[model samples]
Target: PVWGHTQLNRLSFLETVPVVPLRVSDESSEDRPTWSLPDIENVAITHKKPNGLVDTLAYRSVRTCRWLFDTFSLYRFGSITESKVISRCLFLETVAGVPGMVGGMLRHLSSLRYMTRDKGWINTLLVEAENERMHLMTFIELRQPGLPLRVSIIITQAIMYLFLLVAYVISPRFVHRFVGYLEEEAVITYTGVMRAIDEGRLRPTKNDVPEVARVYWNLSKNATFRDLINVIRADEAEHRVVNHTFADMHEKRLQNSVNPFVVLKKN
Candidate 1:
C-alpha cells in the first residue's frame, strides 16, 4: 500500500511543499539561524549536486553519517550553557541518539532497495547515515566538558529532544535528496562565519562587551555562545565533504555503465 517505499506515503503531505525562509529570527537582534534582512542569506539551503556514487552498502554508511553530521551541526545554541558539566551531558545525549536513528533509517532504506534493486544504493545511504551520526557523537564526547557540574540538564535534554524530532521529520533524503545539498551549503556558510571569527572578526556587543575570548585569558564572553555554533559549522563541512564525495562516486557509476565496453558486454 505504500507508494515507492514504506512510510513514504505516510509522509505524502510533504510533497505539497510550502517554502519558508530558513531560521526566521527576531528582527531586533541576531542572524544566521534566525532570519535577517533581505540581503542576509537563509540558513537552510538545497544544493543541486549530481549524485554519481556507487550504491554500495559500505559507502552508504558514509553518506548517512555525513547527512547527520551536517544536519545536527546547524544548531547554533546550546539549550542553555550555564555550566560545563550539564552542557557536556546534554551534548552527549543528543549525539547518542544518532545510532538508533541511523539503524531505523537503514532498515527502511533496505526496504527501498528490495523494491528498486538498484545495486542496493538505498542501503549505502542508510549506512552512511549511521556512520555520520556516529562521528558526530564521537566528536561531541571527545570534547569532554566537566561532568560534575550541574545546571538545567533536564531542560537542555527536553529542548534537544523536541528540536531533534522536528529536524528528523524534515530531514533530507526523506522528502527529497536535494536536502543533502542544502546541508552542504550550510556547512560552507558556517565555515565562512568561522573564518571571520579566526580573522579578528570578533566584535563588542551594543553594551560594549567583547563577543569572543582571547587566547591569553582563555575566557569567552558573549562570544562563548558561538562555540557550539562553530562546532556545528565544522560538522556540516565534514558532511558536505563526505556526501559530495559519495555523490561523485554515484556519477562515476553512471559513466561506467554507459561505457562502450560495459554496454557491449551487457548486450
Candidate 2:
C-alpha cells in the first residue's frame, strides 16, 4: 500500500535565482542568519580551555600564529592609521578563507576514494570558506593592498595551504580547534577596531557601504563603516562557534556522526 514516488504540484512562491550578490540577509529566512545590534554586542567572546595534548597544541599553534601576524603586520609597536586597519582586514581574510577549503577538499576526495558518503560536514566546511572570501571581497572594494602586502598574501597562502593540508590530514579535530582559536582572536581584533571607531578614529572611510556589502548583509543604503564592522564581528563570532562545535564533536566520539548544524545556501 506504500507508493514509492509521487507526483507533486508546484509551490506557491518562486525561489530567488542565484546571481553575483550571493547571500541576502533576512530575519525570517532560515538560511540567512542576521545580527541585530544587541545580538552582536551580546556575543560571547570567550575562549575554550584546552584539556588535552591535542587541544593544547592547537591552542599554542594559534597563539604563535597570532604573535607572528601581529609582529609583522598588526601595528607591532606603533600607532595605527585607517589605512593600516583596512590592510590588516584584507590580510586576515585572505588567510581566514583557506582552512575550510582545505578541509572540504580532502573530505570530498576521501568520500570518493573510500566509496562512502561524507557525513554532512563537507558543505559546512566549504560554506565557511566562501563566507570568509566574501569578507575579503567586501574589504577589497574599500582599499587595495600595497605590493608588499600583495606578495605576502601570495607566499603566505602557499605556505598556509600546505600546512593546513598536512595538519587536516593528520587530524580534523586539531585543525578545527586551531581555527576556532583563530576566530576567537578575530573577535578580539574586531572589538578593538570598533572601539577605535567609537573613539572617533578612522574617520576617512565612507558612510554608505559598498554595493556588494549592502546586498549581502542587507544593510541600509546609509550604512556606515561601523555598521560593516559590527556585522563582520558577528560573523567571526559565528565562525568561532562553528569551528569549536566541530572540534567538540570529535571528543564526543562523533567522528562518524551526521552534521548537527544547517547553514547558508549556494549561489
Candidate 3:
C-alpha cells in the first residue's frame, strides 16, 4: 500500500507540472517577441568570502580550472575587454548550461533509485540550464556566430560536459563551488561589456536590445544593448550566490557526518 501510494503521488506530481512560460516567443525565427516583464529590478549579489579549509580547497580548485581554460583556448582574448561580447557569451553559456543538466540528471536518478524526494533541486537545476540556454538564444539573435567560433563552441562543450560530469560524480561540492567561481567571472566579464558599450567601443546594429530582453527585463522600447547587458550581469551575480550556497550546504552535511565516537576512541 505504501509503494502504491508513492506511485500514485508521483503520478499526480507529474500530471500537475506547471508549464514554464518561455520569455522568448517563437512565432518567427527572425523576430522573437518578448513575452512579459518581471517587476523586481534589484538583484542582491552575494560575495562569498573563503573562510575554512573546505572553502579554501574549493576556491583553489576553481582557480586551477580557470588556469586550465586560459592555457588551452586559442581564442583566449586574455580578457573580456578584448573579445567580442556576443561570441564570448555564446561560448561561456554553452559551458555554463552543462553543470545544471548534469546535476539535475544525477539528482533525478538518485531520487528514483532511493525513492526519496529531491527537495526541488532537480527543477531548480533544470531551470538554471534553461536560463543559460536563453542567454545563448538572446545573443544568437543579436548576431550569428562565425564558423570558427561555432567550431570552438562544439569542441569546448563536448570537453566541458565530460569533465563536469566526472567532477560532479566525484565531488558535487567541488562542482558547485567551481560553478560559483565561474559565475563570479561571468559577472566581471559582463561588467566589462557594459563598460565597452558606455565608452562607445561596441555598437549595436539595429534593435540593439532583443525584443525578448526588453520585455523580460522590463526595459523600454528605446533600451539599448547596454540595458540588456546590465540585466545579464545581475543574473550572473545571482547564479554566483546560488551555487556557492549549494556548496556550503554540502560542506555542512560533510561536517555533520563526523563520527564523535570514533574521534573519542582515537583520542
Candidate 4:
C-alpha cells in the first residue's frame, strides 16, 4: 500500500538516496536561513508575564509538564550521555510535532465551515508541525528506537493529539499561549544539550549526521552534531515568537489583522 515512488524509501525494496523534491507546498524558505549560530548565541531567553487567568493556566501547565520531564529524565544535570540525549530528542520531538497540526486542522475546518479565508494562521501552524516532524525524523535516524519506546511514543501522541484538539476547539488563545511557553522550555533543553556537547560528554561521531537533517537544514557535508542542534534551537526560538504573537493578535481582535509573519511565509 505504499504510495507513489518507493525507490528511495528505506522501507521500500530499493534504497537509493532521494533528492528532496522541489517545494511542492513546502513552506520552508529554500534559501539559506538567516538564523546562524551567532544569531542563536545572542538569542536571549525571555518570559512573557502572564496577564490573565488563561495565560496563567498555560504557564502553570508548562511548569508541570517540565517538572514531570525532569523527573523522568533523572535530572542529574551534572551527568549525561549521547545515547541519553538521543533518546530525549526522539521522545520530545515526536510529541512536539503534534500541536501545530491540531491547531492548523481545526483552523482548516473553520475556514471551510465559514467559507472564509484563514489569513495564514493555518499555514503557520502546519509549517511548525512539519518542522517538528523533521526534527523527529532526523533524530530517529540517529537512534533506532526499540519496542518500549515505540509504544511510548504511540501512547504519548494519542494523549497529546486528543488533548490539544479539544483544547484548541474550546479555547484557541490558551492553546497558542501554552505552545509558546512549551517552546521556551524546548529552547532551554537544546541549550543544555549544547553545553553537554561543549563539556565533551556527548561527542557523537560527526559521520553519524543523518541525510534528512542535512538537506532540510541545508547543512554542510561536514556539519557536526552540535551544528544540527544549533539550527534547531534557532527554530524553537522562531516558534516562541510566532505563538506569542498569534495569541496577542487574537487577544486584540481577529479578521482585521494580516499575518506579520507573511514577510517570510510564502515558499
Candidate 5:
C-alpha cells in the first residue's frame, strides 16, 4: 500500500507539471513533432540581459564557464560526440547537483537562524539537483567514462561547488541567474546531441533504452534511446525556464516590495 501511494505520487507529479515548448525560432513545420523536437535547432540558445551590476557579473561568470567548457571539451573540436556526450553530462551533472544542495543548505541554515520559513525555495532547488543526478545515472547506464574523465569530474565538481557556494553566499540572486544561464547552455548542448543522432552522425550501438531510464521515465519496454533523449531534452527545457524564473523572482525580491507568497505560488 505504501509503495502504491509512492507510485501514485510519482505519476501525479509528472502529470501535474506542465511542459513549456521552447525552440530557437517561432517557425513551425508539419514534419516536426511540435511538443518534442524544435523546428529550430538552436532555439534554446539565448542570453539574459543584464539589469544592473550584479546581473552583469552573473552574465560574465556564466560566459566564462561556457568558454572553459568549449575550450577543454572535445565537442568544440568535433570529435567524440558519443563518448563526449556521456562524459560531458557525467561531469556537468556533478556540478549541476551542487547548486541545489548549496542553495538548499544555505536557505535551510538561514531559516533556522532567522526563525522564519523558507518560501519553498529549498525543496525546489534540492529536487532540481536530484533530477540532475538522475540524468547522470541514466548516462552512466549508457556509457562508462574512463579514469581520466573520472578524475576531471572530481576536480571540476570540487572547484565549481566551492565557487558556486561562495557566489550564493555573497549574492544568491547572481547565483540563481548563473544557474539559469547554465541551463540554457545545457539545452543547447542536448539539442545538438539530438540533432546529431537525427542526422545519423552519432549512433549508439543499441537503440534500447536503459532499464533505469525506462523505470524512471515510465517508458515502455519497446522504447528506444531516441525516446529517452527526447524526454531528457524536454526536461532540460523545463529546467531552463524554471531557473530563469527563479532568477527573476530573486531579482524581484531584492526590491523589498515583492510578495513572497506570490513568488512561491508562481514557482
Candidate 6:
C-alpha cells in the first residue's frame, strides 16, 4: 500500500519510518475494547463468496484505500517540512474527507451491529479511532520528534472540537455500528501494509527507522512479518463490540399497533 512515484534526483526520503504495535492504549474505564487481538491463523486471503453488490463495495473501498495510501506514501516526505500548512490544507480540502470515508465504514458496521448486538463492534470502533489517530500522529511525530508539548495540546483541543461538532447529529447506535465497521477496515489496512512489508515490497528509507521504532515498538520486538499481521488482526478483534449495541437500539424503536411482537422477536 505504500508504493509511490518519486521525482528524479529529488531522492525522496521518509523523515520517519512507520512501525507497528502503536503506543495508543486500548484500556478504558467506560468502554473496554472487544478482545486482545484477532486470530489471523487460518484467515482466508480470498473468500469464495459470490462477488455481489456487497462484495464489490468492499473490494472497491479496499482498493481505494490501497491507492490512497500509496499516493500518500510518496508525499509523506513533504509532510515533515509543512505540517500545519499541509494539515490545514488537507482539513479544508481533503483531510476531513477521511472521516467521511470512515463514516462509510461505520455505516456497514452499524448494519451488522443492528442485526446482531455484539459488544465487539464498540471495541472495534475504539481501535479504529486509535489507528486513525496513529496515522495522523505518523505525520505529527515526524514533524516534531516525541511530539512537541504545544502540538499535543493543540491537537487534543482540535479533536475535542471535531467530536463535539459531529456527535450531536449522530445516534449512539449509529456511532457504535459505524465504529465497528471502521475498525474492521482499519484491520484490513494494517494487514495490507504488513503484507507488503513481509514481501519486501516496501521498506523504510533508512532515516526513518529510529523514529518508527519509538512510536511502534512491536516492529522492533517482533522483527518479523508475522508481527505486522498480528498487529492488524488485533485491531479487528476490537471492532466486534458495537455489533450488539446497535442491534439493541434498533430493537428499542418498535412501533405500529399492527406490528406483531413476533416480528420484533425475529429481528
TM-scores of all models? 0.31, 0.83, 0.71, 0.83, 0.76, 0.37
TM-score, prediction 1:
0.31
**What tens digits encode model 5's per-residue C-alpha lDDT throughout 152-226?**
888888788888889889888888777877777787777777777888888866578777566666567887766
Flag regions of model 5 displaced more than 4 Å: 1-46, 254-267
Better of 3 and 6 by TM-score: 3
Q: Count the backbone clashes (under 3 Å) in each candidate.
A: 22, 0, 0, 0, 2, 21
What does candidate 3 score on TM?
Answer: 0.71
Which structure among the candidates has the greatest lDDT? 2
The superposed Cα distance between candidate 2 and the true structure at residue 237, in angstroms, equals 0.7
- RMSD list, candidates in order: 19.8, 6.8, 10.1, 6.2, 10.1, 17.0
lDDT of 4: 0.79
Report the CA-based lDDT of candidate 2 relative to the real structure: 0.80
Model 3 misplaced regions, further than 4 Å? 1-23, 26-47, 51-58, 64-83, 201-207, 254-267
140-218, model 1: which lDDT tens digit per residue? 4334444532234445556645543454343423212233454555556444544544564643122211222122112
lDDT of each: 0.39, 0.80, 0.68, 0.79, 0.70, 0.40
Query: Of 1 and 4, which scores higher on TM-score?
Result: 4
Q: What is the lDDT of residue 27 in candidate 3?
A: 21
Give Cα distance to truth, residue 26, candidate 3, Å.
6.0
Q: Which residues of candidate 2, in runs, are more than 4 Å off?
A: 1-33, 263-267
| Model 4 per-residue lDDT tens digits across residues 28-147 | 434334466656765656789886999999999789888888787665464677776778878988878798988888888988988877777887888788888888877878888889
lDDT of 6 by residue, 177-247 (tens): 43334445545545555565556566533223234422343345434434434543563443333332342
lDDT of 6 at 63: 57
| Candidate 3 residue lDDT tens string, 165-246 | 8988988888788888888888867766666666877665644577766655557978766667777777677668778867
Better structure of 1 and 4 per lDDT = 4
Residue pairs of candidate 5 with colliding backbone atoms = 23-43, 24-43
Worst ten in a row by lDDT for model 1: 26-35
